[PDB]
Design a protein around this ligand. Structure first.
Ligand SMILES: OC[C@H]1O[C@@H](O)[C@H](O)[C@@H](O)[C@@H]1O
Ligand SMILES: OC[C@H]1O[C@@H](O)[C@H](O)[C@@H](O)[C@@H]1O
Lengths: 383, 383
């Protein structure tokens, strides 16, 4: 009744994340500002990737809507209408509930529900479709009947849902902002262990993107002589600073660890399901290794095997402190994949340690996965 | 097979405009600033409607994608991704072509395809879907094989379409601008008379949706106090533009004229077939009066009495000039019925003249249809 629903949601979130790898590749290639690509190229590609990642919530809404409606386009249109209505009404009503002057809400992001808003809107659309796509109205009202009725009720519900969330969410956003702001002033290693663990926790319900902004873009600051200012870790690194690369722990589990988890899941299938599982696992591992997108791998075992995801999260959190301790410097554009690992080489210090610690993390991930899956008989993809 | 494909375009365009009723309700009853609603409710409804309208190009893209792909949702996702990428690519490439700062272009909407650009994005999505929805990508790349590849290649083609559009737009944009200025502010009388006549002539086939797209979504340019810019006639009236409301002549022949024609057809039926025809024609008259859907009435006699349809087309074409000249302003969501008349009356002007001109139209239609069917001996339903 609920576990099946969560499994459905995870399964339907796959088509939305099928486009993320290419957007990530485009953004990473463009943001490098290569010395050979004409600027208009690496401008257009960067903007395209940014557009995909900005519409991410809408893609998620459409994917959720089609997941529970047997891939019906009317559900997607209703989802788009509902998402727009919900976002605008939330923005409008939040400053009145919170009595802040309509600007601190956007500056501090207390009304940006992120991808979870897409999920809510898509669920609204799917439920309304499932309930009203065969609605029989009187003949003189026949035009607004059947699937034509769904986009109206989906949006009449969106306005009310946005009104509801404008009161139940700023407490959540305010909390996710304070801690995630307390985490910076916290000692260095503690700060980024917290970052890694909480990001792994948050990615499932689509607001780790909100979590990242403070630590990617705002934690730091640096301006050397004639150079311009840069106020974050992701930018300060690509800005060749001497102390960014505090997010260099992403490579350990996004290029070496989760691929190992994917292969471990692959090698623990049924005597015949191996062939079918292998292709998807290999594709997911390749995507994670290359473009630094881990959602295809995580969503594949997250809901069936929550303990594996908790162990993941602990490992990802552990990755950042060790990389800081050894020094392990290498930066990011949007994620931590091969393309970013290479193009942002720049001032990547101690960059030879990444392959070996990555092999260690692959060993550990594979060991825990193939041990726990066999022991508890978890029905990960293939079982 | 051009006729079938044009009808396919017509229905693909009908779908996007079918979600206009929700924006109608919200924005029309919000921007009216009714004294019986608290101001916050009006603000919230107005912004929700504005959000629905700001995605009109996106809804058009989704509708085009679904119409040509047998309602497949992956087409809608491809349409969203492609539209976003195309818009951003144009935004970055147009200043190269026009040799003007991007700030000025963004401020004065020089690079703004609008609903047309939404249609291009939807066409891209539909084409790439129908061509690559059974692709067999390599075994290790199976995570993207199939419908998962359609959004990928659609978004890839979006960049190229965006550059091509940034190169070939200026003339198209200037041409549209001049119709958008003649049809709205120079000669609305003759422009909308032509509109009415052509739409009546195109209804028998289903291409009136193509004929309406410009007049209902392109002409004009209005900016609310909030700063959102509105285009078309329906959005312009809903926003509160004093110069909108040109499509208000639909009420004269949809609410008063065609119901009169239906009653005339019923009253001219033979005795043995006056009860049955009475039921059918009352149903059709109610459908026209309330919703604004006129095809049950017009199909009753159009193929068995074309001359009556020519007279009706002339009268409908004359309706729009008459309103424009007498100042009778009132908006519509999708068609001209009773509900649209009542709900979109906030920004209306001279709403009292509508019933009087309407009873005039009803008398004219009734007398014309009765006398002509009696003399010419037309075999309209019943005879
Ligand atoms: O969601 C796409 C990517 O966003 C990045 O910011 C995160 O670090 C990755 O874990 C994630 O795969
Ligand atoms: O068919 C749907 C409706 O489309 C409108 O644009 C036309 O004006 C009506 O005559 C028609 O009923």
């Amino acid at each position: 009744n609920a576990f099946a629903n969560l499994q459905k949601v995870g399964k339907s979130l796959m088509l939305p994340v099928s486009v993320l790898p290419i957007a990530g590749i485009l953004l990473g290639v463009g943001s490098a500002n290569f010395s050979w690509l004409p600027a208009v190229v690496s401008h257009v590609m960067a903007e395209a990737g940014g557009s995909v990642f900005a519409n991410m919530p809408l893609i998620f809404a459409i994917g959720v809507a089609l997941g529970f409606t047997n891939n019906d386009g009317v559900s997607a249109l209703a989802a788009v209408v509902a998402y727009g209505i919900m976002v605008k009404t939330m923005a409008v009503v939040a400053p009145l509930v919170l009595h802040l002057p309509a600007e601190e809400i956007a500056s501090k992001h207390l009304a940006d529900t992120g991808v979870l808003g897409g999920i809510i809107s898509g669920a609204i659309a799917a439920y309304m479709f499932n309930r009203f796509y065969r609605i029989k109205l009187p003949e003189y009202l026949g035009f607004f009947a059947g699937k034509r009725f769904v986009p109206i009720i989906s949006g009449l519900a969106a306005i009310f849902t946005g009104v509801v969330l404008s009161f139940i969410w700023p407490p959540i956003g305010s909390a996710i902002q304070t801690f995630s702001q307390w985490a910076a002033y916290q000692n260095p290693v503690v700060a980024f262990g917290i970052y890694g663990f909480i990001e792994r926790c948050l990615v499932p319900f689509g607001l780790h993107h909100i979590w990242n902004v403070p630590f990617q873009m705002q934690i730091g600051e640096y301006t050397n002589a004639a150079g311009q200012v840069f106020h974050g870790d992701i930018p300060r690194y690509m800005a060749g600073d001497p102390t960014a690369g505090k997010l260099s722990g992403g490579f350990l589990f996004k290029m070496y660890g989760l691929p190992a988890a994917a292969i471990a899941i692959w090698h623990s299938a049924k005597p015949e399901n191996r062939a079918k599982v292998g292709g998807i696992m290999i594709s997911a591992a390749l995507t994670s290794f290359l473009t630094g997108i881990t959602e295809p791998i995580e969503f594949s075992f997250m809901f069936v095997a929550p303990i594996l995801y908790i162990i993941h999260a602990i490992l990802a959190g552990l990755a950042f402190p060790i990389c800081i301790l050894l020094g392990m410097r290498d930066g990011t554009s949007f994620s931590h994949g091969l393309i970013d690992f290479i193009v942002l080489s720049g001032n990547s210090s101690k960059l030879w340690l990444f392959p070996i610690v990555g092999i260690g993390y692959a060993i550990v991930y594979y060991t825990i996965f193939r041990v726990l899956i066999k022991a508890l008989d978890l029905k990960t993809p293939g079982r």
